[PDB]
Every structure is written in C-alpha cells, then in structure tokens.
C-alpha cells in the first residue's frame, strides 16, 4: 500500500517522527551503504566477510562510514552522479548557525 505524500503530512502534523522513519525505512527501501570520509559518495569497496575497506581514487582504508538510507536515495544519488553531480554525504556539520 502506498504511504504517499498526503499521508506523510499527517504524521508530520502529529509529530510521529520515529514512526514516520519506521514506516519509510523498515517498511520499504533501507540499505547499508559505505561512504568515504573524504568524498561523501559511495565508492568504498566493502569486502566485509574478509574485512577490507578501501576507496581508490582518494586512497584511504581508515575513514569509512556506514549509513542507513533508503535504497531509492542511493539510486537517486547514483542517478545524479551519472549526470556529473556530486552529492557528498558528510557525517558531521560545519554551518552551525
């Protein structure tokens, strides 16, 4: 069943944040991507049942992060990349404000 935009808004008005995440991550999509600490995009090779992480190009085997995001977003970021756009995912902030 579709939990569409119309239904999303009612949970926002209700303030049911933890549920809205569950209804949109445990009920569909969800993925375990490995992103580079340098460039925030999904280049890391995840040889995990051998324990070897690396990101050729910006060679590093130490600054890698696991993130939980919808596979439709992983698809979307990969789609923007094929259009030459870098949507770098950073696990920390800098703007403050």
């Amino acid at each position: 069943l579709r939990f569409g935009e119309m239904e999303r808004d009612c949970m926002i008005a209700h303030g049911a944040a933890s549920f809205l995440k569950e209804r949109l991550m445990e009920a569909s999509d969800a993925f375990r991507v490995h992103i580079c600490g340098i460039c925030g995009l999904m280049t890391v090779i995840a040889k995990l049942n051998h324990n070897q992480f690396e990101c050729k190009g910006c060679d590093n085997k130490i600054d890698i992060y696991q993130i939980h995001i919808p596979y439709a977003a992983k698809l979307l970021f990969q789609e923007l990349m094929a259009m030459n756009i870098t949507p770098r995912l950073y696990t920390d902030r800098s703007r403050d404000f």
Partner: protein, 84 residues
C-alpha cells in the same frame, strides 16, 4: 558545548512528544531485556512497565532540548513535570 543547569528558559513541563518518545524508548529497551528499575507488579507489556517507571519517576533518561542557535538544555526525566 554551552548551557548551565541554573539558567533554564525552556518550560519545566514535559511536552507530549517528550513523554511519547521517552515511553517508547524505555518500552523498546525493556523489550530488549533492559533492567527495570521500578517494582514490577505482574506486567507482560514493556509499555506499561515504562509507564510505571514514569509514574514512580524511576527512569534514568534525560532530555537534551536543542534550541535553534545550537544550545541544548538538559532536563532529567526525574526533574521534568508531567501534567499533560
């Protein structure tokens, strides 16, 4: 890294969202074999156990209320007022 426990502006009363997440978190935790500090009166449901912990105010949780600028005001469950 900025706030003092004597300079407190946010309301001393616990919001409906604070109670709802504290209850769910404790209930989720009790469901995961977490130690129950309240005296258990024969309950099979962790939500009721979490409500009993809230009634006797025996939850070790503490809310960090993030203000728009980046400040955060720490309020223990123990010290928050539950009217609602």
């Amino acid at each position: 890294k900025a706030i003092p426990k004597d300079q407190r502006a946010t309301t001393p009363y616990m919001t409906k969202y604070e109670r709802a997440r504290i209850l769910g978190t404790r209930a989720l935790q009790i469901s995961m074999n977490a130690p129950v500090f309240v005296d258990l009166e024969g309950e099979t449901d962790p939500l009721r156990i979490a409500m009993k912990e809230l009634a006797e105010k025996k939850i070790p949780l503490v809310i960090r209320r993030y203000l728009p600028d980046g400040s955060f005001e720490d309020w223990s469950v123990e010290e928050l007022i539950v009217d609602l």
